[PDB]
Symmetry: C2
Subunit: 67 residues, 2 copies
Amino acid sequence: LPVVFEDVVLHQATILPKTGTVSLEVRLLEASRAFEVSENGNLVVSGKVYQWDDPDPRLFDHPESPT
Amino acid sequence: LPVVFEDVVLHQATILPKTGTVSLEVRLLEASRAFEVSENGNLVVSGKVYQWDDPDPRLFDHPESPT
């Protein structure tokens, strides 16, 4: 699956504890091409994710050097 | 449940069939306080819906008429 992300925003940083686990939940809206990651009911990440329909190898050609 | 809608948007109008039925699917992201209604996988309505924490009757008092 070649994927495309857009307008990714990180609202808060989750801190992994030394002992235990943290549960991260992902909810997708296929129609609106929007996603949302949450922890304990608190929004942590949001943006837009959808499949890349027509990949272009041109995109990954290395850009002209700053120097 | 006193509810508050916000930034509601309608993308298309569904034509109720004369014969048969039409099924609408609604999805909520409680963390983002957003909702989407999809018809056959097509976005129809979008916005933000959340519970009204502190209702106040003063809001519904009729504004004085300019005439």
